[PDB]
Design a binder for these strands. Structure first.
Ligand code: CH1
Ligand code: CA
Ligand code: CA
Length: 1203
RNA sequence: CCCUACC
RNA sequence: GGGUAGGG
């Protein structure tokens, strides 16, 4: 030590400067006060200027109004915590006040007027802080709005009143209008923006006056929207600000809106990979049940928070050897995840959103400085979020002589901790140095060790989910004959044993009962443990006495509540939340463990708008009760869209839409649009005419017209539509057309397999002399396939993939398709398939029974296009169960070849590229799956597999004639695996063809029979295919020309030319709406019409009942309303800040579900799962419900977003 | 279970 | 009938 302790303290208390900066400026002053205060004052700048190269993207905005003069101010800092800090508040509160009277606008004037004090803080704080901008606004009446501190606006308007200007100010803060009027936009920035779009359009091939008109309409919008005037007013999106003003005899002379940080990079920051980055410099020179603990580090930016967590990691690895960007380290007794808390808001967000909780914080302060002024806000954050314990790591202690000085810093911290109710006197404080720790220096190494010892002993072990009291969120209820009432769900915490009593609590008056049993799909059980999906059997209680959403718990452990206060986060436009703010009476859905429930909120004191993206405390009150205690997470929803997360803080005491309007629409909806002749045709023809193309001569021409594959994209697009649009229409009288042809087709395919079956089992030409491409590919493909697939389908493979889903089986019809009827009604099965069923039956205690054992499937017929139906096959139920098993497994394996059968999106893009690039082809086989013969499978597949495939197929088929077929092909369409099998067969060949040619196999991609490989490969692929029995569809395969198609998307030199189809007689208003919407989506660029089509759209829109002509919804909400602008829908009711619009839906009648079967289906599904930012983990999946379609329509109200 | 869009 | 994506 040099000079004395209490000499430095009073140097701090009158300055706020760092400890060592105080001692060291007290030596060069020979123990003199005033002399010292000066060496620092006179060095205030050396510090500040050292911080210039520190990005200050945070801060506050302030705002003041004087009679009718107003100023808006922005002064940055680099941190959340500094912005809410008292001192920094006072600087900006002052630089603002004294900037009012002294009416300034030149940012430099008031800057330099404060520069000598701007250095005061920057020294005392340790963050770059400085005035960023200022501006001034005056008018006849101006008003301001302050959205916390992140954003303020000043609004000046003539002829307006008090609240009006507030509201306008608030709107401005929400909608960011970059001008005050549509006619105020830089007639240059625009006149040259109209000069860029004109190509985008005229290069797509569009005729002069079309590209123009389009661009004009676009630009008219492009502006109206970025202009206060043509902006849907925020407090009533139905009318815009423009109209709001006009009807108040007012206008807006001008406005300013500032937002903290606007246009300042705000350099990204990754925590983990930075620690490893600081760990790298000294990178140089069983018991799995261990408890899991979350810790957060919190303190001043460069007080060494990052170096400490580096230290904590090396040292811990060196010694005890071994969500979202978070380092993790181990102690001999527990396992840690560690986050940084660089921002206050940002942290509160993650704490609500569950993306990062905290069992204890670690407050980091460098002893060379001591607590900073903003250290208050650090501890305060801890306090506000309820971090249960806070440990202190004094850092950089080695850069300190007097040890009495550390005794002194440590006092300051303890006193701060206690000012915020933390155990100041009893809280751990390790005197350490992270730097030396990383230099291996074992003196300062045992302090890190010591810190982790406190982590192990001061932050108490968190409560293992099993040790808390039983609770199971009820997902569904079943009435099971001779086994009472049963609920299913995942037990959330605790254990339930048979015999114990339970309460069922939530939505109605709480009820009591006792546990009869506990079952999973395979085992029956006497206890259910936390994390397990189960059924639990209750006694005396009935199934209409229990609802989903209730919980099952140990008695008295959980109680039902209706009112509570909470901390919630509203998602932004980004995260898929709302895109408009809400206000006083927000009335959304609060989803709890498994169900939505309506609630109203009240905002805290003095807040009256809420924007996507921000935090808020609100007092929520629910329509009826839900079991809850403190801590319980919940989502916030609007029509099943997630717009917020929440956490109950404290439970409290808890002491639009029109009917005739629905009736009007219902009546209209059940009306018949009726016209003469064929409406579909008339529409197509008015369309052909508006694009100036010759109309369809007759019904005959609709289905026999071929497009010219040339001319401009525009010319081709309507030409392609002409060829496709009527091609699947099912109501053509004119034609002895049929489905007789579908069977001929079907018989042709079989006979084809018969030939190639003969051939492939006979290729003894008895002459090696000759070598063949097809032979070669089969050999190569076989070898690749085995490497991918294995000798045989894994048992686990089957365990996670066999399932029932869907439609008809050989015993169930469309009506009894649902999986719950498959578990209830006995299913048929094949003699060869029997052992699978028995094995499944040996596998569970539930009954598993076989209607009948027979080798037949049912060949039926389903619609395809105007020219032919498609023959498929309805399988035996149990065979299906297992087919989907192997089908599911092949789907997984095929990923290793880059083939992803869940994503037809990758095939569409390669179609599009092949379209400009001509380097890729799209190809198509004719009877794709009807042509895979038995022989081909047998040559390609491992024996183990082919056998399993032979057991599971239907060997025989019963046609509608009662006649039979003994199948030549391996499997028919409608089998559980044929799609995935044809994909693998197709890919394996194309890949082998690639290697034979020295192309990259990886360029191959396949989805069913939509095959995409490199163009040069096609001729050889054609030959292989011909050889192994397939016939390639010359008409729908493209390896040159400007055209490509794959998976629904059609492209022409890069432009989307995918058509649309009218399939049915248009008879109801839903039929017509669907067609019109398809027209809309095909003719609209971003909501703007091609004029050619729009004239036809408007012509036919007049055929609808009047109210249905105006009842519009945004795109992506379905087709029970015309797509258009929902803001101008007269029937849209804005109810509680969420907007509700009526759509047409099919009127259903409820049917009785199969109680046992539904319960198996539920349980079986939970089995399937066990073998398998983000608050999506807050929602489940829903209860079995059956319903008949009556032929009528209903009106349903759905939630919408302005869009 | 009932609608639309595709293989 | 099988699968995909979206909707109730
Ligand atoms: N409604 C459909 C459509 C396709 N697929 C499956 O996807 C593959 C694609 O067959 P398509 O290309 O649609 O037509 P193909 O049966 O091969 O007959 P074609 O091209 O001559 O019309 C084959 C089949 O397994 C299906 O099962 N059911
Ligand atoms: Ca095909
Ligand atoms: Ca195809």
């Amino acid at each position: 030590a040099e000079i004395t302790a209490s000499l430095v303290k009073e140097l701090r208390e009158r300055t706020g400067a760092g400890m060592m900066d105080c001692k060291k400026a007290l030596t060069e002053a020979n123990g003199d006060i005033e002399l010292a205060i000066e060496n620092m004052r006179k060095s205030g700048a050396i510090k500040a200027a050292k911080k210039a190269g520190n990005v200050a993207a945070d801060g506050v905005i302030k705002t003041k109004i004087d009679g009718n003069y107003g100023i808006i101010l922005e002064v940055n800092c680099q941190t959340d915590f500094v912005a809410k800090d008292a001192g920094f508040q006072a600087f900006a509160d002052k630089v603002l006040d004294a900037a009012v009277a002294g009416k300034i606008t030149d940012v430099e004037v008031l800057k330099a007027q404060f520069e000598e004090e701007r250095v005061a803080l920057v020294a005392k704080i340790g963050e770059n802080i400085n005035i960023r901008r200022v501006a001034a606004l005056e008018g006849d009446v101006l008003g301001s709005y302050q959205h916390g501190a992140r954003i303020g606006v000043l609004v000046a308007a003539k002829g307006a009143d008090e609240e009006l200007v507030k509201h306008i100010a608030m709107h401005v803060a929400a909608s960011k209008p970059e001008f005050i009027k549509p006619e105020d936009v830089s007639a240059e920035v625009v006149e040259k923006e109209y000069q860029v779009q004109l190509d985008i359009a005229m290069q797509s091939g569009k005729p002069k006056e079309i590209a123009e008109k389009m661009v004009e309409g676009r630009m008219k919008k492009f502006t109206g929207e970025v202009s206060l005037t043509g902006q849907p007013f925020v407090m009533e999106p139905s009318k815009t600000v423009g109209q709001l003003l006009k009807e108040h005899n007012a206008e807006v002379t001008g406005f300013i809106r500032f937002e903290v940080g606007e246009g300042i990079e705000k350099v990204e920051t990754d925590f983990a990979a930075e620690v490893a980055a600081m760990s790298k410099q000294s990178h140089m020179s069983f018991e799995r049940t261990k408890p899991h603990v979350n810790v957060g580090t919190i303190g001043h930016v460069d007080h060494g928070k990052t170096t400490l967590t580096a230290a904590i990691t090396t040292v811990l690895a060196k010694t005890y050897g071994g969500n979202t960007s978070h380092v993790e380290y181990d102690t001999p007794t527990r396992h840690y995840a560690h986050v940084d808390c660089p921002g206050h808001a940002d942290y509160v967000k993650n704490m609500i959103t569950g993306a990062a909780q905290m069992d204890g914080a670690i407050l980091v302060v460098a002893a060379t400085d001591g607590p900073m002024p903003q250290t208050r806000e650090h501890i305060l954050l801890g306090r506000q979020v309820g971090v249960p314990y806070i440990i202190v790591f004094l850092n950089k202690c080695d850069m300190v002589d007097d040890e009495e000085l550390l005794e002194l810093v440590e006092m300051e911290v303890r006193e701060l901790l206690s000012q915020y109710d933390f155990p100041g006197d009893d809280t751990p404080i390790v005197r350490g140095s992270a730097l030396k720790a990383l230099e291996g220096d074992a003196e300062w190494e045992a302090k890190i060790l010591e810190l982790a010892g406190f982590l192990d002993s001061y932050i108490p072990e968190p409560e293992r989910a099993i040790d808390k009291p039983f609770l199971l969120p009820i997902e569904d209820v079943f009435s099971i004959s001779g086994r009472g009432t049963v609920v299913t769900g995942r037990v959330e915490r605790g254990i339930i044993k048979v015999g114990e009593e339970v309460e069922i609590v939530g939505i109605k008056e709480t009820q009591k009962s006792t546990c009869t049993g506990v079952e999973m799909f395979r085992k029956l059980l006497d206890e259910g443990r936390a994390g397990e999906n189960v059924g639990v059997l209750l006694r005396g209680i009935k199934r209409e006495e229990i609802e989903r959403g209730q919980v099952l718990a140990k008695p008295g452990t959980i109680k039902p509540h209706t009112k509570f206060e909470s901390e919630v986060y509203i998602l932004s436009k980004d995260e898929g939340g709302r895109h408009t703010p809400f206000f006083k009476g927000y009335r959304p859905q609060f989803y709890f463990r498994t169900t939505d429930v309506t609630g109203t909120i009240e905002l805290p004191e003095g807040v009256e708008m809420v924007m996507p993206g921000d935090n808020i405390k609100m007092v929520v009150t629910l329509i009826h009760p839900i079991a809850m205690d403190d801590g319980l997470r919940f989502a916030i929803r609007e029509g099943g869209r997630t717009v917020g997360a929440g956490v109950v803080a404290k439970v409290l005491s808890g002491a639009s839409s029109r009917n005739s309007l629905s009736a009007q629409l219902r009546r209209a909806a059940n009306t018949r649009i009726e016209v003469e002749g064929n409406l579909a045709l008339s529409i197509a023809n008015d369309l052909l005419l508006a694009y100036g193309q010759s109309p369809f001569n007759s019904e005959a021409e609709c289905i026999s017209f071929s497009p010219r594959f040339d001319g401009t994209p525009d010319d081709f697009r309507i030409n392609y539509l002409k060829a496709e649009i009527m091609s699947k229409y099912d109501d053509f009288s004119l034609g002895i057309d049929t489905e007789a042809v579908a069977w001929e087709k079907f018989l042709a395919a079989e006979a084809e397999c018969a030939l190639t079956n003969a051939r492939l089992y006979r290729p003894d030409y008895s002459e090696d002399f000759n070598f063949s491409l097809g032979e070669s590919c089969i050999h190569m493909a076989r070898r690749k396939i085995a490497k991918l697939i294995g000798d045989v389908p894994s048992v686990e493979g089957m365990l996670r993939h066999c399932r029932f889903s869907g439609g008809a089986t050989t015993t169930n019809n469309r009506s009894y398709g649902h999986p719950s009827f498959k578990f209830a009604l006995p299913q048929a099965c094949t003699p060869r398939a029997l052992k699978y069923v028995l094995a499944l039956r040996a596998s569970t205690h539930f009954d598993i029974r076989i209607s009948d054992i027979s080798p037949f499937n049912k060949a039926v017929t389903v619609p395809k296009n105007s020219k032919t139906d498609r023959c498929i096959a309805i399988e035996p139920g149990w065979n299906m169960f297992f087919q989907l098993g192997i089908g599911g497994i092949l789907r997984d394996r095929l990923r290793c070849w880059g083939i992803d059968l869940n994503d037809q999106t990758i095939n569409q893009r390669r179609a599009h590229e092949g379209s400009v690039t001509n380097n890729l082809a799209t190809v198509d086989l004719s009877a794709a799956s009807d042509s895979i013969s038995l022989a081909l499978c047998e040559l390609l597949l491992p024996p183990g597999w082919f056998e399993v495939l032979m057991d599971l197929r239907s060997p025989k088929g019963r046609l509608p004639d009662g006649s039979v077929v003994t199948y030549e092909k391996i499997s028919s369409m409608g089998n559980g695996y044929t799609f995935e099998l044809e994909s693998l067969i197709f890919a394996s060949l194309a890949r082998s063809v690639c290697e034979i040619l020295d192309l990259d196999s990886s360029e191959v991609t396949v989805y069913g029979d939509d095959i995409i490989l490199p163009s040069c490969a096609v001729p050889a692929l054609r030959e292989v295919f011909k050889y192994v029995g397939f016939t390639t569809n010359t008409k729908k395969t493209f390896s040159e020309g400007p055209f490509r198609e794959s998976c629904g998307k059609h492209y022409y030199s890069g432009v989307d030319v995918t058509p649309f189809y009218i399939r049915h007689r248009i008879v109801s208003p839903a039929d017509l709406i669907l067609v019109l919407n398809n027209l809309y989506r095909w003719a609209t660029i971003d909501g703007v019409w091609d004029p050619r089509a729009h004239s036809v759209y408007l012509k036919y829109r007049k055929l609808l009942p009047k109210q249905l002509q105006r009842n519009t919804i945004p795109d992506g909400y379905g087709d029970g309303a015309l797509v258009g602008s929902v803001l101008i829908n007269p029937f849209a009711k804005n109810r509680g800040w969420i907007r509700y619009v009526p759509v047409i839906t099919d009127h259903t009648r409820d049917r009785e579900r199969a109680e046992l079967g539904s319960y198996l289906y539920d349980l079986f599904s939970r089995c399937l799962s066990e073998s398998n930012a983000i608050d999506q983990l807050i929602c489940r999946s829903n209860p079995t419900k059956i319903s008949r379609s009556t032929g009528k329509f209903d009106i349903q109200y759905i939630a919408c977003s302005s869009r």
